[PDB]
Swiss-Prot record:
Changing H1Y: Confers interaction with methylated histone H3 'K-4'. Present with 1620 molecules/cell in log phase SD medium. The 2 chromodomains are involved in the binding to the histone H3 methyllysine at position 4 (H3K4me3). Belongs to the SNF2/RAD54 helicase family. Component of the 1.8 MDa SAGA complex, which consists of at least of TRA1, CHD1, SPT7, TAF5, ADA3, SGF73, SPT20/ADA5, SPT8, TAF12, TAF6, HFI1/ADA1, UBP8, GCN5, ADA2, SPT3, SGF29, TAF10, TAF9, SGF11 and SUS1. TAF5, TAF6, TAF9, TAF19, TAF12 and ADA1 seem to be present in 2 copies. SAGA is built of 5 distinct domains with specialized functions. Domain I (containing TRA1) probably represents the activator interaction surface. This is Chromo domain-containing protein 1. Disruption phenotype: Decreased sensitivity to the cytotoxic effects of 6-azauracil. ATP-dependent chromatin-remodeling factor which functions as substrate recognition component of the transcription regulatory histone acetylation (HAT) complexes SAGA and SLIK. It recognizes H3K4me. SAGA is involved in RNA polymerase II-dependent transcriptional regulation of approximately 10% of yeast genes. At the promoters, SAGA is required for recruitment of the basal transcription machinery. It is found in: Nucleus. The lineage of its organism: Eukaryota, Fungi, Dikarya, Ascomycota, Saccharomycotina.
DNA sequence: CACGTACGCGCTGTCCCCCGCGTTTTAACCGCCAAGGGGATTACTCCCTAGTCTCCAGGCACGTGTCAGATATATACATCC
């Protein structure tokens, strides 16, 4: 946990655990921009997710 | 036994759905109360009811005579050539 690297999809290539990165990107980015861009999301929901 | 033709089987394509693998969840499992009821035994008491016995009588089985419905003729009236 000290050799953690700031990487990119083109900077990785093909290593084991790419499905974990895909699940991370899909779930977190899609749900975070969905809860950010929705009009029915209150301030309480946005502060508990933050 | 002869004929003939329909179908079992082999081959090929194709597409689809199940299998293998990785990742994430989730509930099975084990260990815990908290009290209470169900049920397996041990012992005891009581009483109802089914076995046992005796005697008898009618239900069942067999046999036989009849009897009413179904079937097959006997004779008479109507009818075609």
């Amino acid at each position: 946990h000290l050799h953690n690297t700031w990487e990119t999809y083109e900077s990785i290539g093909q290593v084991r655990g790419l499905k974990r990165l895909d699940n991370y990107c899909k779930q977190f980015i899609i749900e975070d921009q969905q809860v950010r861009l929705d009009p029915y999301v209150t301030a309480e929901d946005i502060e508990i997710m933050d």
